[PDB]
Amino acid sequence: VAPLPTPPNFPNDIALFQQAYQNWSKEIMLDATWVCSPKTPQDVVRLANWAHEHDYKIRPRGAMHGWTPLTVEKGANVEKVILADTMTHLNGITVNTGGPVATVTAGAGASIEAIVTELQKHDLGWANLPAPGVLSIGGALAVNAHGAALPAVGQTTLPGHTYGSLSNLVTELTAVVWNGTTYALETYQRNDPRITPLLTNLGRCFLTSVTMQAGPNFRQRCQSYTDIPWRELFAPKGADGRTFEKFVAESGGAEAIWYPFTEKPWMKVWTVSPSLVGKPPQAREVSGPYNYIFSDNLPEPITDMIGAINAGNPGIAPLFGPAMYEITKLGLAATNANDIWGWSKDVQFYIKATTLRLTEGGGAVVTSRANIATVINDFTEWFHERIEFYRAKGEFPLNGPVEIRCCGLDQAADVKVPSVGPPTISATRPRPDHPDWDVAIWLNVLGVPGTPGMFEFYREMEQWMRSHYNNDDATFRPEWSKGWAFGPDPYTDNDIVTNKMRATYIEGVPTTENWDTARARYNQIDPHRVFTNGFMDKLLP
Numbered sequence: 001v002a003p004l005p006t007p008p009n010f011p012n013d014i015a016l017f018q019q020a021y022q023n024w025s026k027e028i029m030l031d032a033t034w035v036c037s038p039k040t041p042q043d044v045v046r047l048a049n050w051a052h053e054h055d056y057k058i059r060p061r062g063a064m065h066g067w068t069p070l071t072v073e074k075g076a077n078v079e080k081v082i083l084a085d086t087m088t089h090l091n092g093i094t095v096n097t098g099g100p101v102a103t104v105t106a107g108a109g110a111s112i113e114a115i116v117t118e119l120q121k122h123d124l125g126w127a128n129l130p131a132p133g134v135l136s137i138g139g140a141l142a143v144n145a146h147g148a149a150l151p152a153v154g155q156t157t158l159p160g161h162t163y164g165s166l167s168n169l170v171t172e173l174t175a176v177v178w179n180g181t182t183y184a185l186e187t188y189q190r191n192d193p194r195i196t197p198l199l200t201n202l203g204r205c206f207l208t209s210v211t212m213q214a215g216p217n218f219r220q221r222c223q224s225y226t227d228i229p230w231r232e233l234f235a236p237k238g239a240d241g242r243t244f245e246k247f248v249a250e251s252g253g254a255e256a257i258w259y260p261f262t263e264k265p266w267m268k269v270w271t272v273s274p275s276l277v278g279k280p281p282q283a284r285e286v287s288g289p290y291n292y293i294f295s296d297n298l299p300e301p302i303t304d305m306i307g308a309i310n311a312g313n314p315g316i317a318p319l320f321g322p323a324m325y326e327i328t329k330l331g332l333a334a335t336n337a338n339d340i341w342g343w344s345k346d347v348q349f350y351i352k353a354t355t356l357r358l359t360e361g362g363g364a365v366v367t368s369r370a371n372i373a374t375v376i377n378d379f380t381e382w383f384h385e386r387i388e389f390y391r392a393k394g395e396f397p398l399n400g401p402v403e404i405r406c407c408g409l410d411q412a413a414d415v416k417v418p419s420v421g422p423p424t425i426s427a428t429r430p431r432p433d434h435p436d437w438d439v440a441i442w443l444n445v446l447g448v449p450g451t452p453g454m455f456e457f458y459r460e461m462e463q464w465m466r467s468h469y470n471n472d473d474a475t476f477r478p479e480w481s482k483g484w485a486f487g488p489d490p491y492t493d494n495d496i497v498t499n500k501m502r503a504t505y506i507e508g509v510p511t512t513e514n515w516d517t518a519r520a521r522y523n524q525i526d527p528h529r530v531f532t533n534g535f536m537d538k539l540l541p
Protein backbone atom coordinates (compact mmCIF):
# COMPACT_ATOMS: atom_id res chain seq x y z
CA VAL A 1 0.00 0.00 0.00
CA ALA A 2 1.19 3.50 -0.87
CA PRO A 3 2.52 5.40 2.17
CA LEU A 4 0.36 8.26 3.45
CA PRO A 5 1.76 11.82 3.38
CA THR A 6 3.94 12.41 6.44
CA PRO A 7 2.14 14.66 8.96
CA PRO A 8 3.88 18.07 9.30
CA ASN A 9 5.98 18.52 12.45
CA PHE A 10 4.14 15.77 14.34
CA PRO A 11 5.05 15.49 18.06
CA ASN A 12 8.37 13.61 18.16
CA ASP A 13 7.51 11.61 21.29
CA ILE A 14 4.21 10.32 19.90
CA ALA A 15 4.88 7.35 17.63
CA LEU A 16 2.84 7.22 14.41
CA PHE A 17 1.97 4.00 12.61
CA GLN A 18 0.22 3.51 9.29
CA GLN A 19 -2.39 0.78 9.69
CA ALA A 20 -5.44 -0.36 7.78
CA TYR A 21 -8.84 0.27 9.34
CA GLN A 22 -11.69 -2.23 9.37
CA ASN A 23 -14.77 -2.11 11.58
CA TRP A 24 -16.24 -5.31 12.98
CA SER A 25 -18.79 -5.84 10.18
CA LYS A 26 -16.02 -5.08 7.65
CA GLU A 27 -18.41 -2.71 5.88
CA ILE A 28 -15.91 0.07 6.51
CA MET A 29 -12.44 -0.78 5.19
CA LEU A 30 -9.60 1.65 4.44
CA ASP A 31 -6.16 0.39 3.40
CA ALA A 32 -4.35 3.18 5.22
CA THR A 33 -4.86 5.46 8.21
CA TRP A 34 -2.48 7.18 10.62
CA VAL A 35 -2.66 5.72 14.12
CA CYS A 36 -1.01 6.55 17.43
CA SER A 37 -1.48 5.45 21.04
CA PRO A 38 -1.46 8.44 23.43
CA LYS A 39 0.19 7.42 26.70
CA THR A 40 -1.69 9.96 28.85
CA PRO A 41 -4.73 12.26 28.61
CA GLN A 42 -2.35 15.21 28.21
CA ASP A 43 -0.98 13.58 25.07
CA VAL A 44 -4.47 13.72 23.57
CA VAL A 45 -4.45 17.45 24.33
CA ARG A 46 -1.13 17.77 22.51
CA LEU A 47 -2.64 15.90 19.56
CA ALA A 48 -5.70 18.15 19.49
CA ASN A 49 -3.63 21.34 19.48
CA TRP A 50 -1.28 19.96 16.84
CA ALA A 51 -4.29 18.90 14.76
CA HIS A 52 -5.84 22.36 15.07
CA GLU A 53 -2.65 24.09 13.93
CA HIS A 54 -2.32 21.85 10.88
CA ASP A 55 -5.98 21.43 9.88
CA TYR A 56 -6.02 17.73 10.77
CA LYS A 57 -8.84 15.85 12.49
CA ILE A 58 -8.56 13.49 15.47
CA ARG A 59 -10.77 10.44 16.07
CA PRO A 60 -10.65 8.25 19.19
CA ARG A 61 -10.24 4.59 18.29
CA GLY A 62 -11.86 2.08 20.61
CA ALA A 63 -12.65 -1.56 19.80
CA MET A 64 -13.67 -0.63 16.22
CA HIS A 65 -17.07 -2.31 16.54
CA GLY A 66 -18.83 0.78 15.25
CA TRP A 67 -21.14 0.31 12.26
CA THR A 68 -21.99 4.03 12.15
CA PRO A 69 -19.20 5.95 10.30
CA LEU A 70 -18.24 8.12 13.26
CA THR A 71 -14.54 7.24 13.16
CA VAL A 72 -13.79 7.08 9.43
CA GLU A 73 -16.10 7.01 6.41
CA LYS A 74 -15.91 4.37 3.70
CA GLY A 75 -13.77 5.67 0.83
CA ALA A 76 -12.95 8.96 2.55
CA ASN A 77 -9.65 10.79 2.16
CA VAL A 78 -7.92 10.37 5.52
CA GLU A 79 -4.59 11.98 4.66
CA LYS A 80 -5.41 14.63 7.26
CA VAL A 81 -6.81 12.40 9.99
CA ILE A 82 -5.09 10.90 13.01
CA LEU A 83 -6.69 8.00 14.88
CA ALA A 84 -5.92 7.91 18.60
CA ASP A 85 -6.04 4.34 19.92
CA THR A 86 -7.24 4.79 23.50
CA MET A 87 -7.15 1.13 24.51
CA THR A 88 -3.35 0.85 24.47
CA HIS A 89 -2.71 3.12 27.48
CA LEU A 90 -5.85 5.04 28.51
CA ASN A 91 -7.30 1.98 30.23
CA GLY A 92 -6.80 2.57 33.95
CA ILE A 93 -9.47 1.27 36.33
CA THR A 94 -10.00 2.24 39.97
CA VAL A 95 -12.97 1.38 42.17
CA ASN A 96 -14.06 4.06 44.64
CA THR A 97 -16.11 2.62 47.52
CA GLY A 98 -15.93 5.73 49.69
CA GLY A 99 -19.08 7.79 49.27
CA PRO A 100 -22.91 7.90 48.99
CA VAL A 101 -22.69 5.37 46.17
CA ALA A 102 -19.86 3.19 44.90
CA THR A 103 -18.23 4.33 41.67
CA VAL A 104 -15.50 3.25 39.31
CA THR A 105 -13.12 5.52 37.42
CA ALA A 106 -11.86 4.26 34.09
CA GLY A 107 -9.77 5.52 31.21
CA ALA A 108 -11.94 5.86 28.11
CA GLY A 109 -10.01 3.03 26.46
CA ALA A 110 -10.82 0.43 29.11
CA SER A 111 -13.18 -2.35 27.97
CA ILE A 112 -16.51 -2.69 29.75
CA GLU A 113 -15.63 -6.30 30.58
CA ALA A 114 -12.44 -5.17 32.30
CA ILE A 115 -14.41 -2.57 34.26
CA VAL A 116 -17.17 -4.92 35.45
CA THR A 117 -14.62 -7.65 36.19
CA GLU A 118 -12.97 -5.27 38.65
CA LEU A 119 -16.38 -4.27 40.00
CA GLN A 120 -17.06 -7.96 40.68
CA LYS A 121 -13.95 -8.11 42.87
CA HIS A 122 -15.70 -5.57 45.11
CA ASP A 123 -19.15 -7.20 44.98
CA LEU A 124 -20.35 -4.47 42.61
CA GLY A 125 -21.85 -4.56 39.14
CA TRP A 126 -24.03 -3.02 36.43
CA ALA A 127 -27.62 -4.12 35.79
CA ASN A 128 -28.03 -3.57 32.04
CA LEU A 129 -24.88 -4.67 30.19
CA PRO A 130 -24.29 -4.67 26.42
CA ALA A 131 -23.86 -8.23 25.06
CA PRO A 132 -20.16 -7.94 24.05
CA GLY A 133 -17.65 -7.09 26.77
CA VAL A 134 -14.93 -6.04 24.31
CA LEU A 135 -16.42 -2.56 23.81
CA SER A 136 -14.37 0.37 25.08
CA ILE A 137 -16.25 2.38 27.67
CA GLY A 138 -15.74 5.48 25.53
CA GLY A 139 -17.28 3.78 22.52
CA ALA A 140 -20.14 2.38 24.59
CA LEU A 141 -21.08 5.72 26.14
CA ALA A 142 -20.92 7.39 22.73
CA VAL A 143 -24.06 5.53 21.60
CA ASN A 144 -25.87 4.99 24.92
CA ALA A 145 -24.92 1.30 24.87
CA HIS A 146 -27.39 -0.97 26.65
CA GLY A 147 -28.55 -4.51 27.30
CA ALA A 148 -31.91 -6.31 27.47
CA ALA A 149 -32.62 -5.62 31.13
CA LEU A 150 -35.79 -4.44 32.84
CA PRO A 151 -36.79 -5.06 36.45
CA ALA A 152 -39.41 -7.80 36.87
CA VAL A 153 -42.83 -6.68 38.06
CA GLY A 154 -42.41 -5.64 41.69
CA GLN A 155 -38.60 -5.74 41.53
CA THR A 156 -36.92 -2.65 42.96
CA THR A 157 -33.92 -1.01 41.29
CA LEU A 158 -31.01 -1.41 43.71
CA PRO A 159 -29.15 1.82 44.62
CA GLY A 160 -26.53 2.51 41.96
CA HIS A 161 -28.12 0.47 39.17
CA THR A 162 -29.97 1.72 36.11
CA TYR A 163 -31.99 -0.14 33.50
CA GLY A 164 -31.30 2.67 31.06
CA SER A 165 -28.08 3.14 29.07
CA LEU A 166 -24.56 3.10 30.50
CA SER A 167 -24.53 6.85 29.83
CA ASN A 168 -27.01 7.34 32.69
CA LEU A 169 -24.42 6.01 35.17
CA VAL A 170 -21.85 8.80 34.70
CA THR A 171 -21.06 10.81 37.84
CA GLU A 172 -18.14 12.69 36.27
CA LEU A 173 -16.02 12.73 33.12
CA THR A 174 -12.94 14.40 31.66
CA ALA A 175 -12.61 15.57 28.06
CA VAL A 176 -10.35 17.59 25.76
CA VAL A 177 -11.96 21.04 25.60
CA TRP A 178 -11.13 24.43 24.08
CA ASN A 179 -10.45 26.90 26.91
CA GLY A 180 -10.48 30.02 24.75
CA THR A 181 -6.92 29.95 23.43
CA THR A 182 -6.00 26.26 23.33
CA TYR A 183 -7.31 22.76 24.00
CA ALA A 184 -6.93 21.43 27.54
CA LEU A 185 -8.37 18.80 29.86
CA GLU A 186 -11.60 19.74 31.64
CA THR A 187 -13.66 17.73 34.12
CA TYR A 188 -17.44 17.92 34.52
CA GLN A 189 -19.65 16.71 37.37
CA ARG A 190 -23.09 15.17 36.76
CA ASN A 191 -24.66 18.26 38.36
CA ASP A 192 -23.03 20.49 35.73
CA PRO A 193 -25.45 21.63 32.97
CA ARG A 194 -22.56 21.35 30.49
CA ILE A 195 -22.22 17.58 30.96
CA THR A 196 -25.49 16.24 29.55
CA PRO A 197 -24.54 16.46 25.87
CA LEU A 198 -21.27 14.68 26.69
CA LEU A 199 -22.89 11.60 28.29
CA THR A 200 -23.90 10.29 24.83
CA ASN A 201 -21.77 12.20 22.34
CA LEU A 202 -21.34 10.04 19.22
CA GLY A 203 -17.60 10.71 19.31
CA ARG A 204 -18.13 14.45 18.78
CA CYS A 205 -16.24 15.04 22.06
CA PHE A 206 -13.02 13.26 23.06
CA LEU A 207 -13.34 11.68 26.53
CA THR A 208 -10.16 10.63 28.32
CA SER A 209 -11.72 9.26 31.51
CA VAL A 210 -15.11 8.68 33.12
CA THR A 211 -16.42 7.85 36.58
CA MET A 212 -19.61 5.80 36.83
CA GLN A 213 -21.77 4.61 39.70
CA ALA A 214 -22.20 0.93 40.43
CA GLY A 215 -24.74 -1.02 42.42
CA PRO A 216 -24.29 -4.25 44.36
CA ASN A 217 -23.48 -7.27 42.21
CA PHE A 218 -26.08 -10.01 41.94
CA ARG A 219 -26.59 -13.58 40.80
CA GLN A 220 -28.67 -14.09 37.69
CA ARG A 221 -30.18 -17.01 35.79
CA CYS A 222 -30.39 -17.14 31.98
CA GLN A 223 -32.84 -19.61 30.47
CA SER A 224 -33.04 -20.34 26.76
CA TYR A 225 -36.09 -21.59 24.89
CA THR A 226 -36.23 -22.76 21.26
CA ASP A 227 -39.55 -24.60 21.52
CA ILE A 228 -42.00 -21.67 21.38
CA PRO A 229 -43.64 -20.94 18.00
CA TRP A 230 -43.08 -17.33 16.96
CA ARG A 231 -46.79 -16.49 16.78
CA GLU A 232 -47.16 -17.60 20.41
CA LEU A 233 -44.08 -15.75 21.64
CA PHE A 234 -44.99 -12.56 19.73
CA ALA A 235 -48.75 -12.72 20.37
CA PRO A 236 -51.24 -9.85 20.86
CA LYS A 237 -51.59 -8.07 24.20
CA GLY A 238 -53.02 -10.32 26.92
CA ALA A 239 -52.64 -13.58 24.99
CA ASP A 240 -52.31 -16.82 26.92
CA GLY A 241 -49.25 -19.01 26.43
CA ARG A 242 -45.50 -18.37 26.62
CA THR A 243 -45.55 -14.73 25.53
CA PHE A 244 -42.76 -12.17 25.40
CA GLU A 245 -44.71 -9.84 27.71
CA LYS A 246 -45.22 -12.58 30.30
CA PHE A 247 -41.48 -13.31 30.38
CA VAL A 248 -40.71 -9.61 30.87
CA ALA A 249 -43.29 -9.33 33.65
CA GLU A 250 -41.99 -12.43 35.43
CA SER A 251 -38.24 -12.01 34.96
CA GLY A 252 -37.53 -8.57 33.53
CA GLY A 253 -34.70 -9.38 31.12
CA ALA A 254 -35.48 -10.92 27.74
CA GLU A 255 -34.21 -11.19 24.19
CA ALA A 256 -35.53 -13.08 21.18
CA ILE A 257 -33.48 -14.04 18.13
CA TRP A 258 -35.71 -15.17 15.29
CA TYR A 259 -33.88 -16.64 12.30
CA PRO A 260 -35.28 -16.03 8.80
CA PHE A 261 -37.79 -18.56 7.53
CA THR A 262 -37.95 -20.43 10.86
CA GLU A 263 -40.85 -21.44 13.10
CA LYS A 264 -39.36 -20.94 16.57
CA PRO A 265 -37.07 -18.18 17.89
CA TRP A 266 -34.22 -18.57 20.37
CA MET A 267 -35.64 -16.84 23.43
CA LYS A 268 -33.39 -15.85 26.32
CA VAL A 269 -34.79 -14.85 29.70
CA TRP A 270 -32.75 -13.44 32.60
CA THR A 271 -34.03 -13.73 36.17
CA VAL A 272 -32.34 -12.23 39.24
CA SER A 273 -31.86 -14.61 42.19
CA PRO A 274 -33.50 -13.85 45.57
CA SER A 275 -22.08 -19.22 47.72
CA LEU A 276 -24.77 -21.10 45.80
CA VAL A 277 -27.52 -19.39 47.79
CA GLY A 278 -30.30 -18.77 45.30
CA LYS A 279 -29.09 -21.05 42.52
CA PRO A 280 -32.00 -22.92 40.90
CA PRO A 281 -31.51 -26.69 41.33
CA GLN A 282 -31.87 -27.18 37.57
CA ALA A 283 -29.41 -24.44 36.57
CA ARG A 284 -25.74 -25.01 35.70
CA GLU A 285 -23.41 -22.62 37.52
CA VAL A 286 -20.99 -20.77 35.24
CA SER A 287 -17.98 -18.73 36.39
CA GLY A 288 -17.17 -16.90 33.19
CA PRO A 289 -18.95 -15.11 30.31
CA TYR A 290 -19.67 -16.17 26.71
CA ASN A 291 -21.47 -19.43 27.41
CA TYR A 292 -22.90 -20.02 23.92
CA ILE A 293 -19.86 -21.57 22.24
CA PHE A 294 -21.90 -22.81 19.28
CA SER A 295 -22.66 -19.21 18.26
CA ASP A 296 -19.13 -17.85 18.58
CA ASN A 297 -17.88 -20.79 16.47
CA LEU A 298 -19.71 -22.19 13.40
CA PRO A 299 -19.26 -25.55 11.56
CA GLU A 300 -18.38 -26.20 7.90
CA PRO A 301 -21.88 -26.72 6.44
CA ILE A 302 -22.75 -23.30 7.87
CA THR A 303 -19.54 -21.57 6.84
CA ASP A 304 -20.07 -23.04 3.38
CA MET A 305 -23.55 -21.53 3.22
CA ILE A 306 -22.17 -18.16 4.25
CA GLY A 307 -19.45 -18.48 1.64
CA ALA A 308 -21.96 -19.35 -1.08
CA ILE A 309 -24.23 -16.47 -0.07
CA ASN A 310 -21.24 -14.13 -0.36
CA ALA A 311 -20.49 -15.67 -3.76
CA GLY A 312 -23.85 -14.49 -5.08
CA ASN A 313 -26.36 -17.11 -3.90
CA PRO A 314 -28.92 -15.23 -1.77
CA GLY A 315 -31.46 -17.97 -2.42
CA ILE A 316 -29.77 -19.96 0.35
CA ALA A 317 -31.65 -17.80 2.89
CA PRO A 318 -34.56 -20.28 3.37
CA LEU A 319 -32.00 -22.98 4.23
CA PHE A 320 -29.63 -20.76 6.22
CA GLY A 321 -32.19 -19.59 8.77
CA PRO A 322 -33.24 -23.15 9.69
CA ALA A 323 -29.59 -24.26 9.76
CA MET A 324 -28.73 -21.51 12.26
CA TYR A 325 -31.75 -22.43 14.38
CA GLU A 326 -30.72 -26.09 14.41
CA ILE A 327 -27.13 -25.27 15.41
CA THR A 328 -28.56 -23.20 18.26
CA LYS A 329 -31.05 -25.84 19.45
CA LEU A 330 -28.52 -28.67 19.21
CA GLY A 331 -25.69 -26.58 20.65
CA LEU A 332 -27.67 -25.43 23.67
CA ALA A 333 -28.53 -29.05 24.44
CA ALA A 334 -25.08 -30.57 23.85
CA THR A 335 -23.37 -27.95 26.01
CA ASN A 336 -26.11 -27.88 28.67
CA ALA A 337 -26.47 -24.12 28.20
CA ASN A 338 -30.29 -23.86 28.22
CA ASP A 339 -30.32 -23.02 31.93
CA ILE A 340 -27.24 -21.28 33.33
CA TRP A 341 -26.62 -19.17 36.43
CA GLY A 342 -23.84 -16.95 37.75
CA TRP A 343 -22.79 -13.39 38.44
CA SER A 344 -24.35 -10.65 36.30
CA LYS A 345 -21.42 -10.24 33.89
CA ASP A 346 -21.13 -13.98 33.29
CA VAL A 347 -24.67 -14.34 31.98
CA GLN A 348 -25.10 -10.90 30.41
CA PHE A 349 -21.88 -10.96 28.35
CA TYR A 350 -22.61 -13.50 25.60
CA ILE A 351 -21.33 -12.09 22.30
CA LYS A 352 -17.77 -12.66 21.10
CA ALA A 353 -16.31 -10.81 18.11
CA THR A 354 -15.98 -14.19 16.40
CA THR A 355 -19.73 -14.36 15.83
CA LEU A 356 -21.02 -14.01 12.25
CA ARG A 357 -20.50 -10.53 10.79
CA LEU A 358 -23.85 -8.83 10.19
CA THR A 359 -25.22 -5.36 9.55
CA GLU A 360 -28.40 -4.06 11.19
CA GLY A 361 -31.55 -2.04 10.69
CA GLY A 362 -34.57 -1.20 12.84
CA GLY A 363 -34.47 0.92 16.00
CA ALA A 364 -36.05 1.77 19.35
CA VAL A 365 -39.71 2.27 20.20
CA VAL A 366 -39.97 4.37 23.36
CA THR A 367 -43.33 3.71 24.99
CA SER A 368 -45.19 2.51 28.09
CA ARG A 369 -44.29 -0.89 29.50
CA ALA A 370 -47.91 -2.02 29.02
CA ASN A 371 -47.47 -1.55 25.26
CA ILE A 372 -44.68 -4.12 24.83
CA ALA A 373 -46.82 -6.95 23.45
CA THR A 374 -48.59 -4.74 20.90
CA VAL A 375 -45.38 -3.16 19.62
CA ILE A 376 -43.77 -6.59 19.16
CA ASN A 377 -46.84 -8.27 17.68
CA ASP A 378 -47.23 -5.44 15.14
CA PHE A 379 -43.59 -5.53 14.09
CA THR A 380 -43.17 -9.29 13.81
CA GLU A 381 -46.39 -9.72 11.83
CA TRP A 382 -45.33 -6.91 9.48
CA PHE A 383 -41.86 -8.42 9.07
CA HIS A 384 -43.31 -11.87 8.43
CA GLU A 385 -45.49 -10.44 5.65
CA ARG A 386 -42.65 -8.49 4.04
CA ILE A 387 -40.12 -11.33 3.92
CA GLU A 388 -42.70 -13.58 2.25
CA PHE A 389 -43.68 -10.76 -0.11
CA TYR A 390 -40.15 -10.67 -1.47
CA ARG A 391 -39.79 -14.44 -1.50
CA ALA A 392 -42.95 -14.49 -3.64
CA LYS A 393 -41.00 -12.48 -6.22
CA GLY A 394 -37.96 -14.74 -5.92
CA GLU A 395 -36.01 -12.19 -3.87
CA PHE A 396 -34.14 -12.80 -0.61
CA PRO A 397 -33.01 -9.48 0.87
CA LEU A 398 -33.16 -10.94 4.39
CA ASN A 399 -30.83 -13.71 5.56
CA GLY A 400 -30.15 -12.63 9.14
CA PRO A 401 -32.36 -12.82 12.25
CA VAL A 402 -34.85 -10.44 13.78
CA GLU A 403 -33.59 -9.53 17.27
CA ILE A 404 -35.89 -8.04 19.92
CA ARG A 405 -35.18 -6.94 23.49
CA CYS A 406 -36.31 -4.20 25.86
CA CYS A 407 -34.62 -2.20 28.59
CA GLY A 408 -35.37 0.88 30.66
CA LEU A 409 -34.79 4.56 30.05
CA ASP A 410 -32.25 6.91 31.62
CA GLN A 411 -34.38 7.49 34.73
CA ALA A 412 -33.36 10.36 37.01
CA ALA A 413 -34.27 8.28 40.07
CA ASP A 414 -31.48 5.83 39.21
CA VAL A 415 -28.81 8.52 39.57
CA LYS A 416 -27.58 8.62 43.17
CA VAL A 417 -25.36 11.71 42.88
CA PRO A 418 -26.53 15.29 42.29
CA SER A 419 -27.55 15.48 38.63
CA VAL A 420 -28.94 18.04 36.18
CA GLY A 421 -30.57 15.32 34.10
CA PRO A 422 -30.24 12.44 31.57
CA PRO A 423 -27.98 12.36 28.49
CA THR A 424 -29.25 15.03 26.09
CA ILE A 425 -29.38 12.93 22.91
CA SER A 426 -29.48 9.31 24.10
CA ALA A 427 -32.26 7.22 22.51
CA THR A 428 -32.97 6.15 26.08
CA ARG A 429 -33.68 9.67 27.37
CA PRO A 430 -37.14 9.89 28.99
CA ARG A 431 -39.78 12.04 27.28
CA PRO A 432 -41.01 14.84 29.62
CA ASP A 433 -44.31 15.09 27.75
CA HIS A 434 -44.91 11.38 28.36
CA PRO A 435 -44.02 10.30 31.92
CA ASP A 436 -45.76 6.97 31.32
CA TRP A 437 -43.29 6.01 28.58
CA ASP A 438 -40.76 3.99 30.57
CA VAL A 439 -39.27 1.37 28.26
CA ALA A 440 -37.24 1.21 25.08
CA ILE A 441 -38.17 -1.67 22.81
CA TRP A 442 -35.31 -2.47 20.46
CA LEU A 443 -36.54 -3.91 17.18
CA ASN A 444 -33.59 -4.96 15.01
CA VAL A 445 -33.05 -6.93 11.82
CA LEU A 446 -29.65 -8.37 10.92
CA GLY A 447 -28.29 -9.46 7.55
CA VAL A 448 -25.11 -10.43 5.71
CA PRO A 449 -23.26 -7.36 4.37
CA GLY A 450 -23.59 -7.07 0.59
CA THR A 451 -26.92 -8.89 0.34
CA PRO A 452 -28.77 -7.47 -2.71
CA GLY A 453 -31.94 -5.60 -1.73
CA MET A 454 -31.12 -5.69 1.98
CA PHE A 455 -30.63 -1.94 2.36
CA GLU A 456 -33.68 -1.23 0.20
CA PHE A 457 -35.60 -3.33 2.71
CA TYR A 458 -34.05 -1.57 5.69
CA ARG A 459 -35.25 1.71 4.14
CA GLU A 460 -38.74 0.24 3.75
CA MET A 461 -38.65 -0.85 7.39
CA GLU A 462 -37.30 2.49 8.62
CA GLN A 463 -40.16 4.25 6.84
CA TRP A 464 -42.73 1.83 8.24
CA MET A 465 -41.42 2.21 11.80
CA ARG A 466 -41.34 6.00 11.61
CA SER A 467 -44.94 6.04 10.42
CA HIS A 468 -46.20 3.28 12.70
CA TYR A 469 -44.50 4.11 16.01
CA ASN A 470 -44.71 7.91 16.11
CA ASN A 471 -48.05 8.62 17.77
CA ASP A 472 -49.73 9.59 21.05
CA ASP A 473 -48.60 6.30 22.59
CA ALA A 474 -45.02 5.93 21.35
CA THR A 475 -42.05 7.54 19.59
CA PHE A 476 -39.51 5.90 17.28
CA ARG A 477 -35.79 6.58 17.61
CA PRO A 478 -33.03 5.00 15.50
CA GLU A 479 -30.44 3.05 17.50
CA TRP A 480 -27.34 5.26 17.10
CA SER A 481 -24.95 2.30 16.83
CA LYS A 482 -26.89 0.58 14.06
CA GLY A 483 -27.95 1.54 10.57
CA TRP A 484 -30.45 4.33 9.93
CA ALA A 485 -31.14 7.03 7.34
CA PHE A 486 -31.16 4.31 4.66
CA GLY A 487 -31.24 6.05 1.28
CA PRO A 488 -31.05 3.10 0.57
CA ASP A 489 -27.49 2.71 1.85
CA PRO A 490 -27.32 3.51 5.56
CA TYR A 491 -26.41 7.06 6.56
CA THR A 492 -27.11 8.39 3.05
CA ASP A 493 -30.70 9.65 3.25
CA ASN A 494 -29.81 13.33 3.42
CA ASP A 495 -33.21 14.46 4.70
CA ILE A 496 -33.12 12.07 7.63
CA VAL A 497 -29.49 12.86 8.49
CA THR A 498 -29.80 16.65 8.24
CA ASN A 499 -33.43 17.26 9.22
CA LYS A 500 -35.31 14.31 10.71
CA MET A 501 -32.75 13.28 13.33
CA ARG A 502 -32.88 16.84 14.68
CA ALA A 503 -36.68 16.76 14.61
CA THR A 504 -36.66 13.49 16.54
CA TYR A 505 -34.51 15.06 19.26
CA ILE A 506 -36.30 18.38 19.76
CA GLU A 507 -39.69 16.70 20.07
CA GLY A 508 -41.26 16.78 23.54
CA VAL A 509 -38.23 18.36 25.22
CA PRO A 510 -37.32 21.92 26.38
CA THR A 511 -35.64 24.30 23.96
CA THR A 512 -33.01 24.68 26.68
CA GLU A 513 -32.05 21.00 26.59
CA ASN A 514 -32.44 19.40 23.17
CA TRP A 515 -30.63 18.52 19.95
CA ASP A 516 -29.70 22.16 19.38
CA THR A 517 -28.46 22.57 22.95
CA ALA A 518 -26.17 19.59 22.34
CA ARG A 519 -24.77 20.89 19.05
CA ALA A 520 -24.07 24.23 20.72
CA ARG A 521 -22.19 22.51 23.54
CA TYR A 522 -20.17 20.36 21.13
CA ASN A 523 -19.20 23.43 19.09
CA GLN A 524 -18.26 25.48 22.16
CA ILE A 525 -15.95 22.66 23.31
CA ASP A 526 -14.52 22.13 19.84
CA PRO A 527 -15.07 25.27 17.70
CA HIS A 528 -12.40 24.13 15.27
CA ARG A 529 -14.18 20.82 14.68
CA VAL A 530 -11.05 18.76 15.33
CA PHE A 531 -13.21 15.88 16.57
CA THR A 532 -15.29 15.36 13.43
CA ASN A 533 -15.43 13.82 9.96
CA GLY A 534 -17.60 14.42 6.89
CA PHE A 535 -20.63 12.53 8.17
CA MET A 536 -20.45 14.19 11.57
CA ASP A 537 -20.52 17.58 9.84
CA LYS A 538 -23.84 16.70 8.21
CA LEU A 539 -25.38 15.26 11.36
CA LEU A 540 -23.98 17.67 13.95
CA PRO A 541 -23.21 21.01 12.30
Ligand SMILES: *Cc1cc2c(cc1C)nc1c(=O)[nH]c(=O)nc-1n2C[C@H](O)[C@H](O)[C@H](O)COP(=O)(O)OP(=O)(O)OC[C@H]1O[C@@H](n2cnc3c(N)ncnc32)[C@H](O)[C@@H]1O
Residues within 6 Å of the ligand: 024, 025, 059, 060, 061, 062, 063, 064, 065, 066, 067, 070, 071, 086, 108, 109, 129, 130, 131, 132, 134, 135, 136, 137, 138, 139, 140, 142, 143, 144, 145, 146, 147, 201, 202, 203, 204, 205, 206, 207, 208, 351, 352, 353, 355, 481
Ligand atom coordinates in the same frame (compact mmCIF):
# COMPACT_ATOMS: atom_id res chain seq x y z
C1 LIG B 1 -19.52 -5.15 16.98
C2 LIG B 1 -20.66 -5.26 17.96
C3 LIG B 1 -21.16 -4.07 18.55
C4 LIG B 1 -22.33 -4.12 19.35
C5 LIG B 1 -22.91 -5.39 19.73
C6 LIG B 1 -22.38 -6.58 19.15
C7 LIG B 1 -21.33 -6.54 18.25
C8 LIG B 1 -20.84 -7.82 17.62
N1 LIG B 1 -23.82 -5.53 20.76
C9 LIG B 1 -24.27 -4.41 21.39
C10 LIG B 1 -25.14 -4.51 22.55
O1 LIG B 1 -25.51 -5.57 23.02
N2 LIG B 1 -25.64 -3.32 23.06
C11 LIG B 1 -25.20 -2.05 22.57
O2 LIG B 1 -25.78 -1.09 22.99
N3 LIG B 1 -24.36 -1.95 21.55
C12 LIG B 1 -23.83 -3.07 20.97
N4 LIG B 1 -22.94 -2.95 19.95
C13 LIG B 1 -22.68 -1.62 19.34
C14 LIG B 1 -21.56 -0.85 20.12
O3 LIG B 1 -22.14 -0.36 21.33
C15 LIG B 1 -21.12 0.32 19.27
O4 LIG B 1 -20.63 -0.18 18.02
C16 LIG B 1 -19.98 1.06 19.99
O5 LIG B 1 -19.98 2.46 19.64
C17 LIG B 1 -18.65 0.40 19.62
O6 LIG B 1 -17.55 0.76 20.70
P1 LIG B 1 -16.09 0.60 20.31
O7 LIG B 1 -15.40 0.46 21.69
O8 LIG B 1 -15.85 -0.44 19.41
O9 LIG B 1 -15.66 1.85 19.63
P2 LIG B 1 -15.32 2.43 18.18
O10 LIG B 1 -16.07 1.73 17.11
O11 LIG B 1 -14.00 2.70 18.02
O12 LIG B 1 -16.08 3.79 18.15
C18 LIG B 1 -17.54 3.86 18.29
C19 LIG B 1 -17.93 5.32 18.66
O13 LIG B 1 -17.40 5.68 19.97
C20 LIG B 1 -16.72 6.98 19.79
N5 LIG B 1 -15.67 6.94 20.81
C21 LIG B 1 -14.74 5.94 21.03
N6 LIG B 1 -13.92 6.22 22.03
C22 LIG B 1 -14.34 7.44 22.51
C23 LIG B 1 -13.70 8.41 23.42
N7 LIG B 1 -12.57 8.19 24.06
N8 LIG B 1 -14.35 9.62 23.55
C24 LIG B 1 -15.47 9.93 22.82
N9 LIG B 1 -16.05 9.16 21.88
C25 LIG B 1 -15.48 7.91 21.79
C26 LIG B 1 -16.27 6.96 18.36
O14 LIG B 1 -15.97 8.27 17.92
C27 LIG B 1 -17.55 6.46 17.72
O15 LIG B 1 -18.56 7.40 17.52
